[PDB]
Amino acid sequence: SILMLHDPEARYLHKILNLLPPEYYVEYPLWSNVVFALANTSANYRPLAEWFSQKCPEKWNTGGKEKLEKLWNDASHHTEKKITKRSIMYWAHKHAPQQYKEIVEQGYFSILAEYVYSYNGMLEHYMIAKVIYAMMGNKFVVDVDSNGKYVWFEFVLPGQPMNQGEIWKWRKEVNPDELHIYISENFSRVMDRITEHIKYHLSQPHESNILNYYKKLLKAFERSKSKIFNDSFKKGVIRQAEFLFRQRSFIQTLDTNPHLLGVGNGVLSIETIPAKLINHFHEHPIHQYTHICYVPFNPENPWTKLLLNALQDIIPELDARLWIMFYLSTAIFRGLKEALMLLWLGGGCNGKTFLMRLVAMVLGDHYASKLNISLLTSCRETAEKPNSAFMRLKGRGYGYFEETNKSEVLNTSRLKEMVNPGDVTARELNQKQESFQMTATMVAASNYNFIIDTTDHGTWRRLRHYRSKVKFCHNPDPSNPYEKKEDPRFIHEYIMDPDCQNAFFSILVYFWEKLQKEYNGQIKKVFCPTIESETEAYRKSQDTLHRFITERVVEVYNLSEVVTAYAEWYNTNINVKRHIALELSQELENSVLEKYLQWSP
Amino acid sequence: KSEVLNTSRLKEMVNPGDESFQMTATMVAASNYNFIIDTTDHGTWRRLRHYRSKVKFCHNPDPSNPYEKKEDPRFIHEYIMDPDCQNAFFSILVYFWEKLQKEYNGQIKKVFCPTIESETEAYRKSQDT
Numbered sequence: 001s002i003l004m005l006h007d008p009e010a011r012y013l014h015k016i017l018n019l020l021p022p023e024y025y026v027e028y029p030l031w032s033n034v035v036f037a038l039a040n041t042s043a044n045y046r047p048l049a050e051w052f053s054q055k056c057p058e059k060w061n062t063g064g065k066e067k068l069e070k071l072w073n074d075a076s077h078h079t080e081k082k083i084t085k086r087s088i089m090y091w092a093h094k095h096a097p098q099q100y101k102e103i104v105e106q107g108y109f110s111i112l113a114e115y116v117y118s119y120n121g122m123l124e125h126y127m128i129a130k131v132i133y134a135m136m137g138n139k140f141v142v143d144v145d146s147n148g149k150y151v152w153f154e155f156v157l158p159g160q161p162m163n164q165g166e167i168w169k170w171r172k173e174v175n176p177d178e179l180h181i182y183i184s185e186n187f188s189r190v191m192d193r194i195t196e197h198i199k200y201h202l203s204q205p206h207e208s209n210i211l212n213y214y215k216k217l218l219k220a221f222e223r224s225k226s227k228i229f230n231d232s233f234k235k236g237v238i239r240q241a242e243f244l245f246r247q248r249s250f251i252q253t254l255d256t257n258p259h260l261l262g263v264g265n266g267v268l269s270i271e272t273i274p275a276k277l278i279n280h281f282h283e284h285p286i287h288q289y290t291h292i293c294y295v296p297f298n299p300e301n302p303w304t305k306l307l308l309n310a311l312q313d314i315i316p317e318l319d320a321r322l323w324i325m326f327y328l329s330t331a332i333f334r335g336l337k338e339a340l341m342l343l344w345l346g347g348g349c350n351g352k353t354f355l356m357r358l359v360a361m362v363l364g365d366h367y368a369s370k371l372n373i374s375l376l377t378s379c380r381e382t383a384e385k386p387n388s389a390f391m392r393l394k395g396r397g398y399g400y401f402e403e404t405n406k407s408e409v410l411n412t413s414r415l416k417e418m419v420n421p422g423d424v425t426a427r428e429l430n431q432k433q434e435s436f437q438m439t440a441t442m443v444a445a446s447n448y449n450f451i452i453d454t455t456d457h458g459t460w461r462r463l464r465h466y467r468s469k470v471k472f473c474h475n476p477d478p479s480n481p482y483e484k485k486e487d488p489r490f491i492h493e494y495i496m497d498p499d500c501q502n503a504f505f506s507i508l509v510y511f512w513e514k515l516q517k518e519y520n521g522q523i524k525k526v527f528c529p530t531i532e533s534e535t536e537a538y539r540k541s542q543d544t545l546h547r548f549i550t551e552r553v554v555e556v557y558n559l560s561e562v563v564t565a566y567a568e569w570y571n572t573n574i575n576v577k578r579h580i581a582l583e584l585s586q587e588l589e590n591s592v593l594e595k596y597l598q599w600s601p
Numbered sequence: 602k603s604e605v606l607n608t609s610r611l612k613e614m615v616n617p618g619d620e621s622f623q624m625t626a627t628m629v630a631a632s633n634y635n636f637i638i639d640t641t642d643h644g645t646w647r648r649l650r651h652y653r654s655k656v657k658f659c660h661n662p663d664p665s666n667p668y669e670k671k672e673d674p675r676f677i678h679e680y681i682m683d684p685d686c687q688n689a690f691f692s693i694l695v696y697f698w699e700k701l702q703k704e705y706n707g708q709i710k711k712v713f714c715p716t717i718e719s720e721t722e723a724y725r726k727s728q729d730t
């Protein structure tokens with residue numbers, strides 16, 4: 001009340017909070033959240049925080065000063081993720097209609113009347129922009145992009161035309177059409193209020209010059225009233241309001257929190273266990289989304305049983321099934337992950353494409369996409385205008401590769417450009433140079449083997465492998481438990497079906513929360529004898545020197561002709577490669593070949 | 602893999618001469634494999650310094666060897682994105698810059714580190730074909 005004279009917006013907030021039909025505050029538990037909203041949002045209101053506490057129906061006034069005792073102690077509070085006054089704006093708006101609305105138009109009319117009175121009934125772009133920003137300031141936001149071009153974002157609400165599944169989220173608009181419709185529809189009511197106010201004053205008894213002044217004002221306002229609908233005037237008003245709606249540091253703070261997923265029925269939160277769905281008002285800056293509705297995991301659903309049976313069919317090994325599901329569970333999380341990546345091959349009709357594609361299109365194009373094999377096949381790095389395919393992983397958490405023409409040797413150098421959870425820079429199509437954040441669960445499956453071509457620690461630790469065990473053929477001959485019939489309905493349909501995708505998403509989130517509760521969070525804790533044994537068998541293979549030791553080494557010599565024997569060991573039987581390893585390769589010289597123990601030239 | 606020096610633009614990079622641009626940066630290279638140098642002239646060998654790391658991190662520390670220690674996954678998986686750790690490291694770096702500024706004048710070819718010269722001379726004894 002000391003600062004009551006200043007900031008009529010304080011009066012506006014007071015009248016807004018006066019329309020709380022039930023006892024909203026109760027006590028500070030379950031309601032301190034709103035208190036924090038006021039505290040953090042109402043910064044300048046350090047004394048008005050205590051003043052509102054005094055006004056709180058269950059507080060110091062009712063002897064409940066201990067309720068705020070845990071609330072004014074953190075006066076500065078060093079605020080974390082912030083609640084906004086728009087949250088306060090939301091209730092007493094969608095909880096107690098009228099009254100609140102009436103004071104809202106009262107404030108609008110006050111501002112517009114002040115502007116009209118000050119400048120003798122002449123209206124320009126900036127005045128309308130101020131009124132509009134004070135009139136719809138909680139639904140639109142403007143921020144300059146990387147290319148130096150401003151963009152418009154609008155919060156979506158139920159009951160209005162929209163694309164499918166973009167509810168409770170922020171949409172990008174090249175032009176705020178709804179803003180034009182609004183300024184051409186709702187603002188005319190305020191202008192009519194101004195006109196009737198002028199008429200009411202005109203009807204009152206006054207001196208002759210007062211009536212002449214009011215007649216001149218009415219004529220000027222009538223002249224200026226039709227300007228609110230002209231195209232150029234509206235465009236200029238939008239251009240002026242552009243500056244008012246600008247909010248610094250918005251685009252770079254969009255879709256940054258990896259614990260929130262944009263789904264078709266709101267936003268999915270995985271901060272706690274169990275994961276909760278926010279299908280109501282919020283304030284998180286979420287723009288990217290997938291069109292998959294989220295439902296709690298339930299095995300009783302027929303599609304869930306069908307999918308579980310399908311996973312059993314594809315992966316006979318229970319431990320391999322569990323490990324694969326746990327690894328795929330990390331696709332939803334868009335944060336930093338352990339440096340793991342696997343491959344798995346097999347014969348035709350194995351079922352790779354079904355599972356990989358289903359995961360890819362259930363995570364959505366925004367969070368997952370298919371990437372070309374040449375992105376890592378090509379060892380040559382791009383200098384200017386890097387790969388736009390290399391830019392497909394921006395924000396994406398999943399990517400799969402199915403393209404191999406016979407055996408292929410990978411770079412083993414650009415792997416750490418994609419496996420290390422660190423940073424890497426890439427320049428987009430004709431816009432600017434930027435940097436990445438390596439957060440993506442990548443997979444690669446196709447026929448034929450992969451040539452690692454190297455024997456080093458690291459890349460070997462940061463890699464896994466698997467092989468198929470079931471084949472589908474139209475001849476399901478008996479005595480072959482690994483041979484099963486085909487279900488072309490699985491690939492041609494059953495994927496475009498939304499219900500199957502929803503069931504798979506439920507299974508995936510259940511597996512993610514299972515990996516969350518047990519094994520802590522790390523993935524290098526689950527025990528899988530099959531996968532580890534297969535990976536160490538792949539370790540034994542592709543290591544030519546080890547096979548040479550195993551079968552050629554029995555029970556001058558200082559690499560003078562040992563290098564020639566090595567270049568004949570594998571570079572003759574198999575075409576030929578440049579074997580530059582020599583005494584320079586002291587690890588090879590001191591490998592198991594050193595069992596001769598001949599350290600003498 | 603092991604890499605061979607090519608004595609191309611090694612002189613250009615080190616040289617402080619002024620498209621064209623200056624090089625007001627500190628350049629360093631490291632690898633797990635020995636480098637190969639073909640040139641012999643004193644022009645390149647008048648500069649450059651070699652060193653060999655001794656301690657190696659192994660989660661299974663073999664006895665009778667102080668070069669085993671252990672792998673700290675928390676040093677890489679985290680402790681890097683921490684603002685506080687970066688602030689402390691920056692403070693240490695500026696403190697060491699001040700240390701180099703107050704003593705030994707400012708030039709770096711004034712502090713005596715006999716280990717580094719001995720190791721560089723030993724390395725130059727190697728690669729002498």
Ligand SMILES: Nc1ncnc2c1ncn2[C@@H]1O[C@H](COP(=O)(O)OP(=O)(O)NP(=O)(O)O)[C@@H](O)[C@H]1O
Binds near residue numbers: 349352485487488490
């Ligand atoms: N559990 C299952 N039971 C029966 N049929 C299935 C099952 N899963 C997939 N199929 C079918 O098996 C066929 C194999 O599909 P697909 O994934 O394209 O084979 P693929 O091995 O992954 N690709 P490719 O290796 O090049 O032949 C499709 O017709 C699927 O509908």
Ligand SMILES: [Mg+2]
Binds near residue numbers: 349353
């Ligand atoms: Mg397939």
